């Protein structure tokens, strides 16, 4: 029924085996109904079978008319759009997944300020970076309810792999244990509401203490803790992200970045999922030497590159240099190669 997990590996419509995927934050803000079944129709022509996507559109007015949003906090309150220009875009995302057999994963609230973030929240409750968000009961109490509305909108669909908490949450200089808190008591609410979902956090993959070479993402200055997290009962698998032009690391330091994770995923007995990958130049040969990696390590069960691009109604899809667009040779070299090659196990 809903997608799971079976020892390392992930289980989609009773298929267990390694899985390719991506990322499309724009889709549930398009308007176009074609576009968007354009694009699941692409993935899955193309064996993509897990679309990552942003779950929130947080403001704190309402928008000019016309621009999605999901969320509005203002006047010390939380209010969701469930209007043709609110939550029936991500319904439709939702169904057309169904349609065409596409397994979402599906996030809260975002850490950075795009589409509002926490700190949106933190703008309308009060408090001081996004950090307050975590601890705060008033901002807690709104994220819990928007949490619970999109939970219980979803219920009866098989479409959507996996709820997750946020997407990239940092606690710069915390102590370790505010984002695991958190994250154990955002993950139990969640399994309250749709035990059988899977849950992730959505994180970067930040702290980790197996194979570290000391560089900052191994360390602890963001707040996470990989393996500390990752024993949270109520989260079923590890994320991490990569960007090594992000983080002053080498391209090659990605495959060690990778390696390392999948240890640290066999010995919690989690699958780990590469989340989120990419760079701005020679996207074939560095992202496609991650992606063989990741196929290739124990404890990693699936990949999804950051993002999908497509040509749509209004013309071509985000390019923030990272995109890569279906039907051109970089969607060769990091699609259809990697989806034949995973079926080539
Ligand atoms: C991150 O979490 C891990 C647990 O997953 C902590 O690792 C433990 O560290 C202590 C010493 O500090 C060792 O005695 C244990 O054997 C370790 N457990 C492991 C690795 O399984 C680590 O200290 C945490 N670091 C933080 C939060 O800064
Ligand atoms: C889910 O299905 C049940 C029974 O078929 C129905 O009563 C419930 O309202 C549905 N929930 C939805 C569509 O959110
Ligand atoms: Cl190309």
Redo the contacts with the bound molecule.
Sequence with gaps: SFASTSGLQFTIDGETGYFAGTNSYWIGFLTDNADVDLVMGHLKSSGLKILRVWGFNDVTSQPSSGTVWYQLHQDGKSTINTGADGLQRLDYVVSSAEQHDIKLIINFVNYWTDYGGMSAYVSAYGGSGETDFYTSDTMQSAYQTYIKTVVERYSNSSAVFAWELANEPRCPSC???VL?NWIEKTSKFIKGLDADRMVCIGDEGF????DSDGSYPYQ?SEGL???????IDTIDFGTLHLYPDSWGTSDDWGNGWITAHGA?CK?AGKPCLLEEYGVTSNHCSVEGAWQKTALSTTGVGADLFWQYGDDLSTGKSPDDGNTIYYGTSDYQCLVTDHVAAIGSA
């Excluded at 803790?225 to 024993?231: G, I, P």
């Design positions: 102590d370790t244990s695991y702290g980790l203490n197996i602890f803790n990989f393996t500390m997290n990752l024993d640290a010995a």
